[PDB]
Ligand binder design. Sequence first.
Ligand SMILES: *[C@@H]1O[C@H](CO)[C@@H](O[C@@H]2O[C@H](CO)[C@@H](O)[C@H](O)[C@H]2NC(C)=O)[C@H](O)[C@H]1NC(C)=O
Ligand SMILES: OC[C@@H]1O[C@@H](OC[C@@H]2O[C@@H](O)[C@H](O)[C@H]2O)[C@H](O)[C@H]1O
Ligand SMILES: OC[C@@H]1O[C@@H](OC[C@@H]2O[C@@H](O)[C@H](O)[C@H]2O)[C@H](O)[C@H]1O
Length: 482
Amino acid sequence: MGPCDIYEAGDTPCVAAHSTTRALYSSFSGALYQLQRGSDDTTTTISPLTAGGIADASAQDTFCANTTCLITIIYDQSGNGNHLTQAPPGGFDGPDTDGYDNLASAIGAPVTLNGQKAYGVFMSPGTGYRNNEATGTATGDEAEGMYAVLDGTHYNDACCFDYGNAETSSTDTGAGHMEAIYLGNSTTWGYGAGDGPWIMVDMANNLFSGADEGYNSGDPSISYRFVTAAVKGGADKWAIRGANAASGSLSTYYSGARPDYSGYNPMSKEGAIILGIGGDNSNGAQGTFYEGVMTSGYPSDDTENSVQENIVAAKYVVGSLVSGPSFTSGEVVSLRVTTPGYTTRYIAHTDTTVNTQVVDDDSSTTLKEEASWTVVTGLANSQCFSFESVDTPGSYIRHYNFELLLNANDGTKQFHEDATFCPQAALNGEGTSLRSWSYPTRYFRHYENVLYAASNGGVQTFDSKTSFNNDVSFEIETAFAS
Ligand SMILES: *[C@@H]1O[C@H](CO)[C@@H](O[C@@H]2O[C@H](CO)[C@@H](O)[C@H](O)[C@H]2NC(C)=O)[C@H](O)[C@H]1NC(C)=O
Ligand SMILES: OC[C@@H]1O[C@@H](OC[C@@H]2O[C@@H](O)[C@H](O)[C@H]2O)[C@H](O)[C@H]1O
Ligand SMILES: OC[C@@H]1O[C@@H](OC[C@@H]2O[C@@H](O)[C@H](O)[C@H]2O)[C@H](O)[C@H]1O
């Protein structure tokens, strides 16, 4: 039995079921999600290896070979057709074309379910999926239950990383017009004990960590690499239950009556489905979606313990983020451009500007240093790396407004995440392709001799698809700074 089988057995069936990693029903064998490579814009679907099995990753790898990929659709295994597509603009606009949010990369969250490779949905700020016209999802004050397996170590405080019930107009229509899971350390509304993140319930104009608006000590900081967030709501009653999806039971952080404030009882849920964003399209949050569902009816604590147990069984385990050459901490390297007509330039810098210059043995000591980088363990992820200036120690290469700059490490989380880059076998085949970690859709890329955290096609002029593969492939060579 898969999650939704258990939910069916409990008389609280799924009305929406999403996951890019595995089937949620034992008998499901259809398409899980859809891909689309930047090479030719053509698509393809990835399904389970076998009925109710894990996703056929190799197929995604085959399809995305020597190019970039995005997840265009996360199908609803339930049959209701509540697939999740690119989120539209609402109370806020997305960073993508005409106000849309960004589709996520297909390789930003590689994992293995019981030894089998699969891909999660790594969402950077500005990314979001939605379905404003679902079927079967609770509305009005109707009871419902939901859950999700997220990455307890990927998130922020910006509004809002959700997965649940939202408004069908993509606008904030007031309190009680939402019921979605939330995971982050935002404190603009509710919040819990510790530094976070916290599993909270977005009920519109308020993320709730418990009964009282604002602070609630009953909701603890939950930060496992694989978190199971279970949330349910009914007639003047709801609850927050969390657990290490990798192992163990669900714990109850909240159980009781609706927060005692106008508009929260009875509820006024509209029935749309959102992911990685807020009900009015707030898109400043980040997270990782592995699998999750919504249901009709208030699930019994028992029913949920079964789902959790099944999850633990799925055996989630972080997957390799690196491919290609790769480096070793403490290694001093020099990165050479492979694009035809620029093959004698190296990634260097002029103060905080990271660019490409012509460096050779006649070059000054200063430039050989500005063109030499010390590779240290990824500031935000030990699997990957961060690049430190040889000439300017204490500073690393980080993206800002998507421009590679040379700033000093200020010890913060932001800096850490903006300075982490993961090695991938060069798209053109020559060397490595340095993929951002916090923005898996972006790679080190030179555009008119200046470095950017560019995507294969986008809203920035430097996101150009023209010469992309070459502009993101670099050869690792001996550091000029010896
Ligand atoms: C959410 O958690 C992060 C990480 O602990 C907090 O970030 C720090 O941010 C402040 C405000 O900029 C800096 O003084 C600290 O130096 C940062 N520390 C780290 C470790 O990054 C963030 O403030 C938290 N958000 C809220 C709303 O409380
Ligand atoms: O690389 C992208 C990103 O740029 C920096 O933030 C800019 C910030 O984001 C919006 O709220 C506003 O446009 C601006 O204040 C981050 O350092 C980096 O991750
Ligand atoms: O970074 C070097 C180079 O810049 C970008 O293209 C520049 C383009 O080429 C000629 O047609 C003109 O000089 C200019 O519009 C590429 O992305 C990159 O390889």
